[PDB]
Amino acid sequence: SGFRKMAFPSGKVEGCMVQVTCGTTTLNGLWLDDTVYCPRHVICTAEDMLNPNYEDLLIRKSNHSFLVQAGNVQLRVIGHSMQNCLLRLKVDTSNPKTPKYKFVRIQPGQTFSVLACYNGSPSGVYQCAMRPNHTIKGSFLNGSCGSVGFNIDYDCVSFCYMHHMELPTGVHAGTDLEGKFYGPFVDRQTAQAAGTDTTITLNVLAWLYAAVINGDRWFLNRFTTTLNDFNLVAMKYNYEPLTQDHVDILGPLSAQTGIAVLDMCAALKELLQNGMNGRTILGAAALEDEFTPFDVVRQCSGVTFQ
């Protein structure tokens, strides 16, 4: 047995998924109250993409220019405006399934569930992480743009991501629900590539704590180490320099197990050098880095409120 990387229940977000078509282009859109958000490039097709000038293209678009459907029911768009890389379409209808929500920009390393969609229809839901290079390694085949990344805290949905394009790498680039891209990517099919990727040290550590929490603690030892000396080691195996801030995000976890952050660092330091000896951790073969210090708490407790 082991530990599962669970995705938030997609119910609440499913009820906000719609299809947005502009001529020959069709993608997904977020329907929150009387507005539909979607990648601004919905207004493009063919060579436009090879460096368009949205301002002008938009200025030559009208409401009837946008067809939008929720199921087999049209939503008449009665207004339109651009916000950075996002397009905000006003509709003659308020989404009665609109959940309590909010938009938050995420920081590299944090996580969220993605509800993959095609032609305004849900397809599957998965859990991923905003990679240190500002890209996500999801599964976004043809026309997944407009799909969104969210988190849930009680009855509130925190939309934090929206898929726009595919980087050569086979990784994705998107924005926050306020039209700002993540990383140095622009919504123009130009020569652009992801920077160098690293393992999210903070999450690997959170994962060990989770391992421990579950009785899988053979990899521990009596010694600690310097935040500095750990980094000189991580930097060799391609781990992100651990920081004071990081050590603090691990506080509740370090508190629940009684294992100080540095103590656990010495532990990781070895699972890195001194291979692993064919042994395991939460079953799996390698150290997982897509569970945050909050995901571990969240999943190791069916928490309050109701």
Added chain:
Amino acid sequence: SSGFRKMAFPSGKVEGCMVQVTCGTTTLNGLWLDDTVYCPRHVICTAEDMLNPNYEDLLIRKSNHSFLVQAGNVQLRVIGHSMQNCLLRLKVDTSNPKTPKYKFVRIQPGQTFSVLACYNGSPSGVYQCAMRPNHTIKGSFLNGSCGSVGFNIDYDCVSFCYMHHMELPTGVHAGTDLEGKFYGPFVDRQTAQAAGTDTTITLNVLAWLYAAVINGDRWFLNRFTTTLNDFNLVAMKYNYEPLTQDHVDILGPLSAQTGIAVLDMCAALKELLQNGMNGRTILGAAALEDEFTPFDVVRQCSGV
């Protein structure tokens, strides 16, 4: 080019069926479709009971009044009951309006599904897994996930296949199908029972290696193919299920696609097995995955 994630189905249609069933100081999840509410029968057991309980005896001494059903902040008047193998079928007055098109189907070891993990009839998370070969299923079940269901979705039809019943000692989980029939040599009793000897699901691993190739990655191939029995003779040794001609055929379109003979992919596996993965990685993974059926790959490599 690439990017292969293990996706689960949208839990939306199932969340709309999750409720809470309490009997005495005991509480777990329940599935609510139309006017029936399903859940493990051991809801009616307290401490002792669980140690060799005569359920037929325990049930007659129970009445509709004993069953507290809660749809959020709304009780449901249970108007009758009856047991079906290991499940409980409580009738109620209110028919669940959110009941989707549903089908009860018995899955097979190796087949994959999505579990809607709940605690107190309240959605907590969704994940994709495989019915392990020993019938158990490693999950994120902890305390009261009992009653949570496993499923598949086609079009708009939800196919309920599993329902969590108990956490076995090893730390894995046992459950029954939506008909109360258990998966595996298990029973709803706290006794001396553990998971059978588990094995890796070869058919899936291969599929995953095809999936790995189509996305662009193929550092593990080798033009020098092997025979079907010789692969088994080798796989069985590393604790992988034997591969029948039936599995090979299954990897038909996956091969025809990547343009690699199943038997060939097998030779590549025989190596990945013996030559411990060079320390490198396949599909961003660091270990061979087997929770992807040859179909899970087709689905995630073409349409919806």
